[PDB]
Amino acid sequence: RHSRLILAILAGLGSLLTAYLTYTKLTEQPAAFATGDGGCDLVLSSRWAEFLGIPTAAVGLLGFLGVLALAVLPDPLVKRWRWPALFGLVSAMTAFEMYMLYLMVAVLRQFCMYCTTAIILVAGLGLVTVLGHRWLDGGKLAFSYILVAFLTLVTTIGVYANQVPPPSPLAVGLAAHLRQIGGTMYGAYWCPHCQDQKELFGAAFDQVPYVECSPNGPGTPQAQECTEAGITSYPTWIINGRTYTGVRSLEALAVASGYPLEEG
Secondary structure (H helix, E strand, O other): OOOOHHHHHHHHHHHHHHHHHHHHHHHOOOOOOOOOOOOHHHHHHOOOOEEOOEEHHHHHHHHHHHHHHHHHOOOOOOOOOHHHHHHHHHHHHHHHHHHHHHHHHOOOOOOOHHHHHHHHHHHHHHHHHHHHOOOOOOHHHHHHHHHHHHHHHHHHHHHHOOOOOOOOOHHHHHHHHHHHHOOEEEEOOOOHHHHHHHHHHHHHHHHOOEEEOOOOOOOOOOOHHHHHOOOOOOOEEEEOOEEEEOOOOHHHHHHHHOOOOOOO
């Protein structure tokens, strides 16, 4: 009943998923499955999927390679520190993953199988670590978690708040011009490319006239308003009667919008 073999076995698998989720991003190859419009295509290609410059998969590698090491190292300065070390580490791993899951539930509204697996794997770990050895302290486990979780979440968010810079400075100037001219961007929410186009503006985009094209996601016919103006792919800008395809630079959009760029 008590075992740390379920640890090394899950931690091994965890290591492999993470390993070639990293190898994928790190070589920019597509994920073995997906590319079916949004999904792992959006998720993996979105920001967040990188953490402090490296792949977030690569972060999860350190996690899954940590938990494996502890589980596989024989009882050594670890005998005393194994089952607390394992706990703190896995606590962190569950916390991170709940925020990742949150990202998918809200503020991506999209899911990834490779990412879901990760979660379930860590959920297997979380069960095992709690039930695979008891201190029967109760109060400390409940505390220790709430600490580590709070420490993970604070750092995690504080890294992802570092991820998006201010909408500066024409980013806001243009978003107000587009709002006034009525130049509109048509795009999906599941579209990675549109997310990129949204990225260039930053928090300024909230002014931009946007038309959500598929309110019911992938595989379902697009909203009428998009089919009326004659959209095919995303993103599409119709600014001043003229239509423009794909992502374009703030400079390129300024030209299409009649915004006066000044450098003298």
